[PDB]
Design a protein around this ligand. Structure first.
Ligand code: ANP
Ligand code: ADP
Ligand code: MG
Ligand code: MG
Lengths: 269, 293
């Protein structure tokens, strides 16, 4: 849980995995300068949009991100400063949880779904207890470490760029205000994705009408497999007033109680 | 790695909690005033579909803690869970600044109001039928293990003079298979143990049922009137109860008095009440002396 720094010659990008809202993720290799070994890693490239040119030096948000370590988050192996910031992590071949639940769907156990809820909650709780706000939590940003364990990824990235709509809270859309509460909102949307086996939030709508719907009292509909008990949680996550929303501790706990008896809270066959 | 399981063979609650946007329903007028919030009469048009639906819209005053709107959300939970002809149903909620429950409108509204305004067209068989329907509703509530901690004439709505339903659920709590009692205010409707030890059971709602029937038989009189909320425990402890209503025979007042026994197990069951009042309802002028019929 200490931040390691790389030189630009130590890293080599082999293939583009894909791009998102912030940076571009490459499947690459790490070759320490002394050696000829190639170690498979994941190199995310973020372009410096500061204008002050300050990804040339390791900042303190960088050291903050480079610090964090937990059983259910994606740990940052290292970083490489310069024109473009390079975030180096482990290559998780199993891919994102989104694709996973989209591919296996109901074939996955309800126990697995609930437990994954618990794990994601634990990761976000860790991040919250160390002052880290995610600002981009989604089903795509939760990767599979093990077939039975998941880790939260892409945390802290948003605060590296100068000042995703379907996972953002209302205050975030309206005023660009980001807190752990907004992360709770996004968590709600993520679990919704999970329990619907990877559905698109607000599918029929366009990006323009999502905040409208939210301000009028509309939410994402109850998932077919979700008991009212599990949907109530997501509903309380999508509250307009921040201080009403659950804490990550409470979420982890209630999902733990639910995980202690899966068929009572999820109906799948 | 994974959470260890220990299963309790109870059934999954698959109640559907539908959510509506504010623009789907209109507010016409006010039905109820209070500190809790406001109850509106209005129209709900589901978009797509043809119909416009008369509805009641209950809207809430913002949260105190993480707990204050827990209240309204548990209320919505309960109202979405129940399904019975004599307890009516949540149609959906609007999650805005202020949470809004949306139920089916009951044209004639409060039953207390009804027995107060129509004093001299209320015949034996309507009163007795009302008692039967309320008993049925409470029986359904008991058989799904939730206790209505606030049963009273105020909280019974009138769909039609023939047909009444039960509603509040603001204080209602769901007992586990585990539990038998609930440990926690309407003083003059609660059982003695509820005042002394804050204990609530299905047998407390029987006391509340007795007081309710007393309200109906007195055409909407106020229980223990002139006697403040403090004190009442003493009164009940001496053995004093509500007086015998003028229209009631010794048998009906027998049932009422039996509902107000100290020993909670001595009190009748809602089953028994359904049977008894249904039996009385087939010869109503025998058990109630009212001059209109
Ligand atoms: N550690 C990793 N191992 C394997 N694939 C990864 C890893 N991290 C990211 N990816 C993949 O990188 C691709 C695109 O990266 P990225 O753009 O950061 O994610 P994203 O899906 O667009 N979500 P966003 O944070 O909005 O950008 C996705 O297909 C991910 O599966
Ligand atoms: N669905 C409804 N139809 C007609 N009147 C209603 C309805 N819901 C509430 N009311 C009015 O509100 C009062 C009771 O509502 P209730 O939900 O018990 O309020 P609270 O419990 O918040 O005091 C009654 O006087 C009744 O006239
Ligand atoms: Mg990502
Ligand atoms: Mg009331």
């Amino acid at each position: 849980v200490l931040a390691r720094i790389f030189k630009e010659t130590e890293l080599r990008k082999l293939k583009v995995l894909g791009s998102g809202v912030f940076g571009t993720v490459h499947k690459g290799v790490w070759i320490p300068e002394g050696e000829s070994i190639k170690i498979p890693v994941c190199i995310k490239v973020i372009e410096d949009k500061s204008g002050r040119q300050s990804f040339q030096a390791v900042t303190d948000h960088m050291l903050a991100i480079g610090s964090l370590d937990h059983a259910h988050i994606v740990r940052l192996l290292g970083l490489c400063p310069g024109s473009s910031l390079q975030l180096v992590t482990q290559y998780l071949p199993l891919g994102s949880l989104l694709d996973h639940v989209r591919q296996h769907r109901g074939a996955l156990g309800p126990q697995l779904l609930l437990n994954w809820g618990v794990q994601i909650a634990k990761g976000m709780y860790y991040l919250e207890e160390h002052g880290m706000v995610h600002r981009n939590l989604a089903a795509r940003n939760v990767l599979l470490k093990s077939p039975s364990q998941v880790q939260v990824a892409d945390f802290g990235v948003a605060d590296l760029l100068p000042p995703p709509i379907k996972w953002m809270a209302l205050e975030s859309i309206h005023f660009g205000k980001y807190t752990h509460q907004s992360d709770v909102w996004s968590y709600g949307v993520t679990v919704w994705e999970l329990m619907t086996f990877g559905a698109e939030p607000y599918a029929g709508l366009r990006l323009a009408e999502v905040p409208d719907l939210l301000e009028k009292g509309g939410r994402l509909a109850q998932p077919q497999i979700c008991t009212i008990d599990v949907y109530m949680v997501m509903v309380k996550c999508w509250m307009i007033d921040e201080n009403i929303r659950p804490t990550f501790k409470e979420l982890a706990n209630e999902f733990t109680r639910m995980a202690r008896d899966p068929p009572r809270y999820l109906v799948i066959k | 790695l994974v959470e260890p399981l220990t299963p309790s063979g109870e059934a999954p609650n698959q109640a559907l909690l539908r959510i509506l946007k504010e623009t789907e329903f209109k507010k016409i007028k006010v039905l109820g005033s209070g500190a809790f919030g406001t109850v509106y009469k209005g129209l709900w048009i589901p978009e797509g579909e043809k119909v416009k639906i008369p509805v009641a819209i209950k809207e809430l005053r913002e949260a105190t803690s993480p707990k204050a709107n827990k209240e309204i959300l548990d209320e919505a939970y309960v109202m979405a869970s129940v399904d019975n002809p004599h307890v009516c149903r949540l149609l959906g909620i609007c999650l805005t600044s202020t949470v809004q429950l949306i139920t089916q409108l009951m044209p004639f509204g409060c039953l207390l109001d009804y027995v107060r305004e129509h004093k001299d067209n209320i015949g034996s068989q309507y009163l007795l039928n009302w008692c039967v329907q309320i008993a049925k509703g409470m029986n359904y509530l008991e058989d799904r293990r939730l206790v209505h901690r606030d049963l009273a004439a105020r909280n019974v709505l009138v769909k039609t003079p023939q047909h009444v339903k039960i509603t509040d659920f603001g204080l209602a709590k769901l007992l586990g298979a585990e539990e038998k009692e609930y440990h926690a205010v309407p003083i003059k409707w609660m059982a003695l143990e509820s005042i002394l030890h804050r204990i609530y059971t299905h047998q407390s709602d029987v006391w509340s049922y007795g007081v309710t029937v007393w309200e109906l038989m007195t055409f909407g009189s106020k229980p223990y009137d002139g006697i403040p909320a403090s004190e009442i425990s003493s009164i009940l402890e001496k053995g004093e109860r509500l007086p015998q209503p003028p229209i009631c025979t010794i048998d009906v007042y027998m049932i009422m008095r039996k509902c107000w026994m100290i020993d909670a197990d001595s009190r009748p069951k809602f089953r028994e009440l359904i049977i008894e009042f249904s039996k009385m309802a087939r010869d109503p002028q025998r058990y109630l002396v009212i001059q209109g019929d």
